[PDB]
């Protein structure tokens, strides 16, 4: 069932054929070209492999997900954010955010992956959220937008609470304009501590091909300031 990819087709096998263990392993090979990536993301598939290995594609079941509104914000964090020492921006520095995540060292984001996603950023599908402390980038997150659905790739923090601020502000900005869901692919300690919950793959896909044809304001992803103390 594990399909082998080639340049001959940008097509992927059905997610329902993925292996049960490792969870969701669907295919390997291919490349990280724009066409192939957008094809995979609109089918509920995504690349995830360690440096050295061939490209691995997954579509796990259950699927990790985060409902924007359901974002869990601690009492201490709100106190912190009410007097946030941070300013947040959108798509101001995608290059730096993905670097911060890849360099964070916690390093499955090889240069090949950085270049491929940076390329998506340039084509209008990969977006980043920058957290600034003064004039320095201290955190942020980035993901691929799928209409009213946002597939989170990764976030990074260099100063206490930068990540949460990014995510916090994004969620606010996101739900205020129609954003409906956040894909986390796989649940993990950090992602779960935020409100990420699991849901069957069948539902995720229903939600996916449902929110991919929706839209946010025409100027929603235009580089801009989202929160300034």
């Amino acid at each position: 069932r594990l399909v082998q990819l080639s340049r001959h087709s940008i097509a992927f096998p059905s997610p329902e054929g993925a292996l049960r263990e490792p969870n969701g392993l669907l295919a390997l090979g291919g490349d990280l070209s724009p066409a192939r990536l957008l094809m995979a993301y609109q089918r509920g598939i995504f690349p995830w492999f360690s440096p050295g290995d061939p490209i691995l594609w997954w579509s796990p079941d259950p699927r990790a997900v985060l409902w924007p509104e359901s974002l869990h914000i601690s009492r201490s964090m709100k106190r912190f954010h009410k007097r946030s020492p941070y300013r947040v921006t959108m798509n101001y520095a995608f290059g730096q955010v993905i670097e911060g995540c890849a360099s964070d060292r916690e390093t499955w984001i090889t240069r090949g992956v950085v270049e491929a996603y940076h390329r998506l950023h340039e084509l209008g599908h990969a977006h980043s959220i920058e957290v600034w402390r003064e004039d320095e980038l201290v955190g942020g997150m980035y993901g691929v937008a799928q209409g009213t659905l946002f597939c989170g790739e990764s976030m990074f923090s260099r100063m206490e609470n930068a990540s949460k601020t990014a995510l916090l502000v994004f969620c606010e900005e996101f739900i205020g304009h129609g954003g409906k869901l956040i894909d986390c692919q796989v649940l993990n300690d950090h992602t779960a501590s935020l409100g990420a919950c699991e849901i069957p793959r069948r539902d995720y896909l229903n939600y996916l091909n449902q929110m991919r044809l929706g839209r946010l304001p025409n100027n929603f992803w235009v580089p801009r300031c989202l929160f300034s103390p």
Binding site: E106, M155, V186, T191
Partner: peptide
């Protein structure tokens, strides 16, 4: 955000 694990 799979890259966190």
């Amino acid at each position: 955000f799979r890259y966190l694990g």
